[PDB]
C-alpha cells in the first residue's frame, strides 16, 4: 500500500476514556490500570469496556495512522461514529457505528455482524488503519509483514463524523497489561 503519505497525528481524548485507563502525558499511549484512576464520571466515558477515542474528528478526505500492539493478548482497533453508545453492553458492528478488527484468544476477527475470521500468517506488532471518507472504505494493514492487507470494509455508511477507536482489552490473565501506542510518522 502507498497510503503512508495520508499520515495524520492522532492523540487520545482523556474525557472519553474508561475510568481505569492511564493515558501518557503526550496522549499517544494508553494502558489498563490495576484500579479506578481517580477521575470524575461524565456522559462521554465508555463504562463497560476499556475503550477510548482519538481527539480528531474526520468528515472528509483520506487519513492513515499506525498502532503498536506488541505483546498484547487482546485489543480492538479501528474507527467509530462520534455518536456511538458509551454506556452499557453493545457489540462492535457497522450497524452500531464501529469499523474495527480485534485479537481475542489467539484469533483475529473483523467486527462485522456476525464477525469474520481473518487469515494472518505473521502476528502483527503494528497495525496500519486507512480511512477514505468519500469512498466509504476502512482498511487494515500488517506493518510487521511488509504492509500486507488484513481486511477492507467497503460500502461503509459512516452517517457522521468519525473518531479513531481503541480498546486495550481486559487483563484477567495477567498477560495483557501492555499499552496501545500511536507510532511516529
Ligand atoms: C482484570 C481486569 O482487567 N479487570 C479490570 C476491570 C474490572 C472491573 N470493571 C472494569 N471496568 C469496566 C472499568 C475493569
Please state the domain extents for the chain.
4-182
CA distance 118 to 108: 5
Complete edge-to-edge strand list for the sheet that includes strand 51-53 = 51-53, 162-167, 75-81, 98-104, 107-110, 116-117
Indicate whether residue 32 lines ligand 1 (CB < 6 A).
Answer: yes
Whether residue 117 contacts residue 109, with contact meaning beta carbons closer than 8 Å, is answered with yes
Indicate whether residue 12 lines ligand 1 (CB < 6 A).
Answer: no
Superfamily of domain 4-182: SPRY domain (2.60.120.920)
Query: Ligand 1 centre and the CA of 170: distance in Å?
Result: 6
Indicate whether residue 171 lines ligand 1 (CB < 6 A).
Answer: yes
CA distance 20 to 170: 10
Q: Which residues contact 15 (CB under 8 A, 6 or more apart)?
A: 42, 44, 45
Say if residue 75 is exposed, middle or buried (CB neighbours under 10 Å; 0-12, 13-18, 19+).
Answer: buried
Query: Ligand 1 centre and the CA of 47: distance in Å?
Result: 10
The closest of 90, 23, 96 to 53, measured between CA atoms, is 23
Considering only CA atoms, which residue is closest to atom 6 of ligand 1?
A: 170
* Resolution number, Å: 1.4
Whether residue 110 contacts residue 154, with contact meaning beta carbons closer than 8 Å, is answered with no
Query: Ligand 1 centre and the CA of 154: distance in Å?
Result: 34
Indicate whether residue 176 lines ligand 1 (CB < 6 A).
Answer: no
Amino acid at each position: 500500500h502507498h497510503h503512508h503519505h495520508h499520515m495524520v497525528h492522532i492523540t487520545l481524548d482523556r474525557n472519553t476514556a474508561n475510568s481505569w485507563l492511564i493515558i501518557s502525558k503526550d496522549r499517544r499511549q494508553v494502558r489498563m490500570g490495576d484500579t479506578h484512576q481517580n477521575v470524575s464520571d461524565n456522559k462521554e466515558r465508555f463504562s463497560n469496556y476499556p475503550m477510548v477515542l482519538g481527539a480528531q474528528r474526520f468528515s472528509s478526505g483520506k487519513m492513515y495512522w499506525e498502532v503498536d500492539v506488541t505483546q498484547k493478548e487482546a485489543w480492538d482497533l479501528g474507527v467509530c461514529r462520534d455518536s456511538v453508545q458509551r454506556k452499557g453492553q453493545f457489540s462492535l458492528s457497522p450497524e452500531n457505528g464501529f469499523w474495527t478488527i480485534w485479537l481475542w484468544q489467539d484469533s483475529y476477527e473483523a467486527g462485522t455482524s456476525p464477525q469474520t475470521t481473518l487469515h494472518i500468517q505473521v502476528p502483527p506488532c503494528q497495525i496500519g488503519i486507512f480511512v477514505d471518507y468519500e469512498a466509504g472504505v476502512v482498511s487494515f494493514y500488517n506493518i510487521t509483514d511488509h504492509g500486507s492487507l488484513i481486511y477492507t470494509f467497503s460500502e461503509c455508511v459512516f452517517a457522521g463524523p468519525l473518531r479513531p477507536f481503541f480498546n486495550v482489552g481486559f487483563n484477567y490473565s495477567g498477560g495483557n497489561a501492555a499499552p496501545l501506542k500511536l507510532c511516529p510518522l
